[PDB]
Amino acid sequence: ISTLSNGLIASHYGVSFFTIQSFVSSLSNTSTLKNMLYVLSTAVEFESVPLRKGDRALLVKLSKRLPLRFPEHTSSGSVSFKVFLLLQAYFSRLELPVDFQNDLKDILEKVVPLINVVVDILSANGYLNATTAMDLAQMLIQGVWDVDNPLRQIPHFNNKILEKCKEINVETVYDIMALEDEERDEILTLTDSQLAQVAAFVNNYPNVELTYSLNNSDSLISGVKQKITIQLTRDVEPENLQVTSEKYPFDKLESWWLVLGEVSKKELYAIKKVTLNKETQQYELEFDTPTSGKHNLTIWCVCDSYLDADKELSFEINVK
Numbered sequence: 576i577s578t579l580s581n582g583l584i585a586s587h588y589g590v591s592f593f594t595i596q597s598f599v600s601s602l603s604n605t606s607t608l609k610n611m612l613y614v615l616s617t618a619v620e621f622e623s624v625p626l627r628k629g630d631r632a633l634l635v636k637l638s639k640r641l642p643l644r645f646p647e648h649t650s651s652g653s654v655s656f657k658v659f660l661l662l663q664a665y666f667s668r669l670e671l672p673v674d675f676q677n678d679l680k681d682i683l684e685k686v687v688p689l690i691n692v693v694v695d696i697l698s699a700n701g702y703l704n705a706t707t708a709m710d711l712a713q714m715l716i717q718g719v720w721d722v723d724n725p726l727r728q729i730p731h732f733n734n735k736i737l738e739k740c741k742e743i744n745v746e747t748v749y750d751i752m753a754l755e756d757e758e759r760d761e762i763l764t765l766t767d768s769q770l771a772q773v774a775a776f777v778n779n780y781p782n783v784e785l786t787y788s789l790n791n792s793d794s795l796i797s798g799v800k801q802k803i804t805i806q807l808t809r810d811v812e813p814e815n816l817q818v819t820s821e822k823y824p825f826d827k828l829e830s831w832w833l834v835l836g837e838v839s840k841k842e843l844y845a846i847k848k849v850t851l852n853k854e855t856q857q858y859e860l861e862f863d864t865p866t867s868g869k870h871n872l873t874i875w876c877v878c879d880s881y882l883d884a885d886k887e888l889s890f891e892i893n894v895k
Contacts, residue, residue: 576599576600577599579699579700580699580700580701581699582845582861583698583699583700583701583843583845583846584695584698584699585694585695585698585832585846585847585848586691586692586694586695586848588687588688588691588692588695589688589692590618590620590688590689590692591619591620593619594618594619594620594689594692595692595696597617597618597619598614598692598693598696599696601614601617602614602693602696602697603702604697604700604702604703604704604841605704606697606704606707607707608707608710608711608721609643611693611707611708611711612643612659612662612663612711613645613646613655613659614693615658615686615689615690615693615711616655616656616658616659616662617655618658618685618689620685620689621654621655621658621682621685622654623681624654624657624658624678624681624682625677625678625681626653626654626657627674630657631651631652631656633672633675634651634656634657634660634661635651637660637664637669637675638660640667640669641660641663641664641667641669642663642667642720643659643663645659645660657678657682658682661675661678661679661682662679662682662686662715664679665679665683665718665822666714666718666719666720666723667720668718668719668727668822680824683715683823683824683825684825686715687712687715687827690708690711690712690715691712693708693711694708694709694712694832697843698843698846701842701843701844702841702842702843703836703838703841703842703843704841705834705843705846706834706875706877709832709877709879712879713878713879713880713881713882714882715823716818716820716823716827716879716880716881717820717822717823717880717881717882718820718821718822718823719822719882721882724737725747725748725882725883726740726745726746726747726748726751728748728776728881728882728883729748729751729773729776729777730769730772730773730775730776730819730821731765731769731772731773735764736762736763736764739761739762740762743758743762745762747883748777748780748883748884749782751777752777775819776819779813779817779818779819780819780881780884781809781829781851781878781881781884782809782810782884783807783808783809783831783851783876783884783886784807784808784809784886785805785806785807785874785876785886785887785888786805786806786807786808786888787803787804787805787806787874787888787890788803788804788806789801789803789804789890789892790802792892792893793892793893793895794895795864795892795893795894795895796864796894796895797864797865797866797867797894797895798863798864799863799864800861800862800863800864801861801862801863801864802859802860802861803835803845803859803860803861803862804857804858804859804860805833805857805858805859805860805874805876806855806856806857806858807831807849807851807855807856807857807858807876808854808855808856809851809853809854809855810854811854812852812853812854813829813851813852816828816829816850816851816852817829818880818881820880827880828850828880829850829851829878829879829880829881830848830849830850830878830879830880831848831849831850831851831876831877831878831879832846832847832848832849832875832876832877832879833846833847833848833849833858833860833874833875833876834846834874834875834876834877835860835862835872835873835874836872836873836875837865837870837871837872837873838871838873839871844862844863844872845860845861845862847860864894865894866894867894867895868893868894869891869892869893870891870892870893870894871889871890871891872889872890872891872892873887873888873889873890874887874888874889874890875887
């Protein structure tokens, strides 16, 4: 299978060779988020997580309230059953038994290297569903479903506050920071300690601007390695890139994937993992020029640590 491309591997995260061999065999260009969550749950790295007598029976009961079911003709007798379900309880923000809370902390300690390896395997194959693993990576940091309200990321945003936001058509983090003092204090019925934690989050939440330059557009030759420059600007230089997350109990640094690809062909042409630590920065990507004709290409700038802060740009090329 490893006729894989070295230049299409963005990170240096590591796990056992056993797990890498298993992941490579288990993932394809059609893998879904649910498939990837299952595959991740099978990592031998989780064998250090406790599995007690009675846990499976307790997990079966818990599973009633979770949206995704464990694969049908697969034994529920291993730690993978626990990992698959507790990670969903994490996304759903279910209150857990103290003992399952302990196991969840142990699980979360191992997830970042594992999800990054999933991204790297898919991207090394040129598979655009690497972006599906990126979606899952975001959920693992903020502890929120990709189908739930993205405002849930902000500390102390309970159901009452979410409904007050809906009533005035406030939907994004940027809508929150745009609010006038009196309307802001109307919705944010929170204590002093709580308000400071909202403030910490909103000030650190990224707002990036994506541009590019492609030298000699509409004069490209098929097959030749082509360079493209990607620039990303922030309003001011960040004082630190330490991620604010209520739910992820370990230190995390803000990182981004820069992705070039073509949606209609489900193909990833190039990828790069970057830190946007400056007011402005640019990066050079290299790809093989596709066949003769018109192609619609997209650049994505995807954050590993927050939801709804990603940026994308589409453009047309003509290969002679």
